Amino acid sequence: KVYHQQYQDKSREYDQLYEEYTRTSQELQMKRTAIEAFNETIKIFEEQGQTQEKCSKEYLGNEKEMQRILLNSERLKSRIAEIHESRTKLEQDLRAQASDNREIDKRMNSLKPDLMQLRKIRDQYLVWLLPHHEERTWYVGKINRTQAEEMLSGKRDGTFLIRESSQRGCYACSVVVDGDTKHCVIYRTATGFGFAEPYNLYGSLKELVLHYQHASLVQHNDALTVTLAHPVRAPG
Amino acid sequence: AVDSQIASDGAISVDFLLPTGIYIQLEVPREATISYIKQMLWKQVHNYPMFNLLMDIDSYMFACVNQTAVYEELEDETRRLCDVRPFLPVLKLVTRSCDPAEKLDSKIGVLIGKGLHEFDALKDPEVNEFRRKMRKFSEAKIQSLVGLSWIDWLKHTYPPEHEPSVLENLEDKLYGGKLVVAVHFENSQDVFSFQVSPNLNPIKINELAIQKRLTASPCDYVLQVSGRVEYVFGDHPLIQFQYIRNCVMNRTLPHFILVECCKIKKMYEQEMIAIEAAIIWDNNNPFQITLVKGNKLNTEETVKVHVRAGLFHGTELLCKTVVSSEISGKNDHIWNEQLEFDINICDLPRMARLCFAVYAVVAWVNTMVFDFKGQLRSGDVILHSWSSFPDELEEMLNPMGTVQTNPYAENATALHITFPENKKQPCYYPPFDKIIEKAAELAGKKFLAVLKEILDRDPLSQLCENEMDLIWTLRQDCRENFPQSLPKLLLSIKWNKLEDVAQLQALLQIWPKLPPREALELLDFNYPDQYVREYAVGCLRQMSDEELSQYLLQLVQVLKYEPFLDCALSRFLLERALDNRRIGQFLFWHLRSEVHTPAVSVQFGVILEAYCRGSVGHMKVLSKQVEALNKLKTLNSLIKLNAVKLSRAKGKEAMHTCLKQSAYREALSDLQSPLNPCVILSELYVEKCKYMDSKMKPLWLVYSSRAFGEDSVGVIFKNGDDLRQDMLTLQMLRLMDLLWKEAGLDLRMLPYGCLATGDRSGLIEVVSTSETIADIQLNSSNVAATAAFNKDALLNWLKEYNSGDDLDRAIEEFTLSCAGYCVASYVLGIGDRHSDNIMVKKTGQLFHIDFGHILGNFKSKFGIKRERVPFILTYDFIHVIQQGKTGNTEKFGRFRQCCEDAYLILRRHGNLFITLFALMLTAGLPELTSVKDIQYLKDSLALGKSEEEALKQFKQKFDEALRESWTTKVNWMAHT
Ligand SMILES: CS(=O)(=O)N1CCN(Cc2cc3nc(-c4cccc5[nH]ncc45)nc(N4CCOCC4)c3s2)CC1
């Protein structure tokens, strides 16, 4: 009777299994490498047993060398001993790590179809296959910096009241920075509007304002800090 | 504890197995010279019986078992005991003159990391059938090498690189026609300069070279590139040689050394000295398979039992998902059942793949219906399954997975199966000729419009039945107008019946050869046929070694896919690698990098020895490197340890002293770069070698190319990380640079060298005079250290190293390289790029560095997830392009032009990208897991939409980044 509640926490249970398995399988080929090496070392010691027995039959003085050789065959016998035990203890640890990895495929492959069953519910989950918004709130038509500084002085340290530039068919932006009012030129171009050439792709002087309340002025000038939180017509 | 390499200092108790069986144990210092030990043992030899049946020290040499079960005959008596870490302390003193050419078989097993006996230990026919097949051919090449006179040998060992008409795009980056080339004689201290036509033959430089009054034929001399085993000679124009082309292209001075024939003769003779060390169809009935028991103890709550079957030919299924009899899914595993296969035995593809699994709701084995010689697999066969190895998506039964079974028996799954062995005379595949006779017996200007709209849709896009029908219907018409459509056609017909198959095979022979770039598709999962593949490579066989080296990575990954061993691809790759320009080395290196992994261990292992064998000469150099790399691994291991108890600057010293020691300065010095086979390595500039701040503390090796090489080389050895994503994304970048230059666009890109040499090991190549943009920014007086720490730091940087005229090229090279990277990044969906991973050379060139994730978002292995990588631009790039110059429309416009142009060029070869990323599925990358992954490209490249419908999309994406130009600039290093 259960539907969509969560997923993310049980999803990561696969890696809680896979992160240790990959390390374990890696250690198992590594542990098998040594048994191959161990089983190959023995082969050389085994060859020694043959040679010491064949080379010893060479008695072509013979009484004192009967025991000196015997001793060395019996020490060489005792080396292949501890190295058969040393190999067996590693062979026992392979059997252990390998058994543990089988009890993990018992956990790994049991949680894999949970996502396969989820497919019918999961893929069917379907439905689909701001005070600057007013023009006059920041626009102040034909003005001069003198008349711009006038209004803005006394207002908060982040207000927008944009004039029109001294320059023929341009615009300007009079802004109260954290300290006082600063005025920059906003430009017209076929590409749109904006303070500087590669960065003036704004269709309207309003969509610009709307995309500079989020973004800082700092790029165009280090001096021009604060963005635009308040235009004109504050509550209360 | 599994090997002696951890923090320990003193002597070690080693066993000395004499030829007379005299066992002797002696405590010998750990870091002792193997000759010092040989001498040491010799002292006590007499206090032990049989002291007289021995010869002198110098007639005997030690032998051991490596950390890899290999019997290591130690000729080089100068190696430290620990520098040749024997698995067990034991050393068998053998006679130096143990000449049975099993001393060769030692030398080989050692290089590879698999002892040759292991192939005999498999006892399975094919391994031996093919080791012996290749050995015949490998030894034919060794024999080809013996006759050859001087210079002709060079053409076989290090052949010069040719590149016709690449200049018919970009012309004369030379003062007039005249090329400026530099030459000096062998051990000469004085160089000479020449003004030369780029259209002349190298012989003119030799004629000019002899014009030095100091009192031989120009032909008795050869032009070797100064600091590389790279040679330039032959009846060809100077510009045609890739070397010259590059110097021309990057306004660099071609550096040549003149070698007297007798010096190359000398090398040839010393190599030939070592070369001497070479001492039924008519069975109209249904097909069905009988099987017996399984072997699982595994228990499940919601569902009890598990058992499945079914058979395919690539992706295409030929039967329904056949189930089986229910036993005890919590206890009893033994059973028997006759498995129903509603398919005739006559209409069966010789490349048919019988697949098996169980009810996952759990292991799998997939084994082929036919064998190495196309004999119907029949009789009792054991199938060693892959438990907990199935991928998340497989279409019930997995058809993709290997036909080569699990190496483990104990505590690793298996399966019992029998096939119709019945008759004393068996059933073999219909001959390579008889299927053409089957077709001969069986015997569109309007459509031109329709099928162009069908035979276009990208390799990953799979056709719907009706399309398939028309493709087969109008098959002769498309053969004549759309030859490039056979990949689509080869998938149109169901491989279920022989009549169509015959007609299809007939077509291939009478079908023209597609280009190598195109042919590559015919080597993925879609096309498993032994004759399409034989033709696919057919086309590759007609490609340059330089073009070959390009698609080599994924060609090696197709060897991983291959179901057999004696395939045309292996035969081709070895045929090519045995005649290498530098091919053989990468072929060899790429193979070891994976021989460590079970499923490929036999595969690559065999191929590897088959190379080593045909490479009896060069063998020394490859080993020189293997030793060079191991020494690095350890020094790094010690570097990790040091870093804890050592100061950043004290651990540097530690590293420096370690390098300065007898063992290091010998091993990892004066023996050829693995990254570039031509690049010589020579003396280390120790004082300048370092290790990185990173979690794996990677080494930074600087190689002062002594006297001859103009400047220094710089390598990065990194052990602990998967260096394969980089290795592939860097190769992808090399392609984009290829394609753009092809179309006509040198965006001055830097896909710097990268090779993963093993398991989480490998090398990155260092780019000279470079710097991280984070590095450039901090440690600079940011506009008199007053405002915005970022702005113009990157500009002043360039200004510092570029004087007047130079500043223009610098910013010019900055722009297009930035443009080139901006596109290539987005397109390949390279994520989480920050000023810490973007870099700038002192030439102005820009480039990328930490390729953690591609074709989706970067999330660590624990929680690996995907996200669309948007196009990104930083304020910092624009600012430089601009120069800070408040208003323009020619430089930040030149940028956008390039950006657009580039994006459009990639779109055209979008299929080439999707094909390579598709062949790279086998490789096993954490990212490339499925065809759902390659599907990212289709979107990034806007592969459905037309050029201008798709340009408009990107034209918008690019502008939207100019909107987030400071916004992204912030994300690059604010918190970072
Ligand atoms: C002095 S310090 O080295 O200890 N320290 C740590 C890092 N350094 C900056 C650099 C990091 C860096 N990482 C990489 C890399 C990292 C991980 C994976 C990779 N794939 N490719 C490169 C690379 N590739 C690099 N090269 C550069 C040029 O040639 C090319 C590479 C550089 S340069 C400076 C401060």
Numbering used by the authors:
A (entry chain B): 441 to 500, 507 to 575, 608 to 714
B (entry chain A): 13 to 227, 235 to 298, 320 to 401, 432 to 513, 525 to 1057
Q: Could you pull the original sentences from the published paper?
A:
The class IA PI3Ks are obligate heterodimers, consisting of a p110 catalytic subunit and a p85-type regulatory subunit. They trigger a cascade of mammalian signaling pathways downstream of receptor tyrosine kinases (RTKs) by generating the lipid second messenger phosphatidylinositol 3,4,5-trisphosphate (PIP3), which recruits effectors to lipid membranes (Engelman et al., 2006; Vanhaesebroeck et al., 2010). Among PI3Ks, the p110β isotype is uniquely activated by both RTKs and Gβγ heterodimers (Kurosu et al., 1997; Maier et al., 1999; Guillermet-Guibert et al., 2008). p110β controls platelet activation and thrombosis (Jackson et al., 2005; Martin et al., 2010), DNA replication (Marqués et al., 2009), and male fertility (Ciraolo et al., 2010) and contributes to insulin signaling (Ciraolo et al., 2008; Knight et al., 2006). Consequently, p110α, p110β, and p110δ need to be tightly regulated. This is achieved by the regulatory subunits, which stabilize the p110, inhibit its basal activity, and facilitate recruitment and activation downstream of RTKs.
In an attempt to unravel the structural basis for the inhibition of p110β by the cSH2, we crystallized full-length mouse p110β in a complex with the mouse p85β-icSH2 (residues 423–722) in the presence of the PI3K inhibitor GDC-0941. The structure was refined at 3.3 Å resolution. There is one copy of a 1:1 p110β/p85β complex in the asymmetric unit, and the density for GDC-0941 is clearly visible. In the overall arrangement of the two subunits, the long coiled coil of the iSH2 slots into the large arch formed by the catalytic subunit, while the cSH2 nestles against the C-terminal region of the kinase domain. In contrast to the nSH2 of p85α, which is in contact with three domains of p110α (C2, helical, and kinase domains) (Mandelker et al., 2009; Miled et al., 2007), the cSH2 of p85β contacts only the C lobe of the p110β kinase domain. Our structure shows that a cSH2 loop (Ala674 to Tyr680), which was described as a protrusion at the surface of cSH2 (Hoedemaeker et al., 1999), forms the main contact point with the p110β. This loop interacts with a double layer of helical pairs, the Kα7/Kα8 and the C-terminal Kα11/Kα12 of the kinase domain. The Kα11/Kα12 elbow is marked by Ser1046, which is at the center of a hydrophobic groove between the two elbows, including residues Tyr956, Ile959, and Leu1043. This hydrophobic groove accommodates Tyr677 in βF of the cSH2 (SH2 secondary structure nomenclature follows the description in Eck et al., 1993), and Ser1046-p110β is positioned to form a potential hydrogen bond to the side chain of Tyr677-p85β. In contrast, the pY-binding site on the cSH2 is exposed and not buried in the interface with the p110β. In our PI3Kβ structure, the C-terminal helix folds over the catalytic loop, presumably locking it in a closed, inactive conformation, and His915 from the DRH motif points away from the active site.
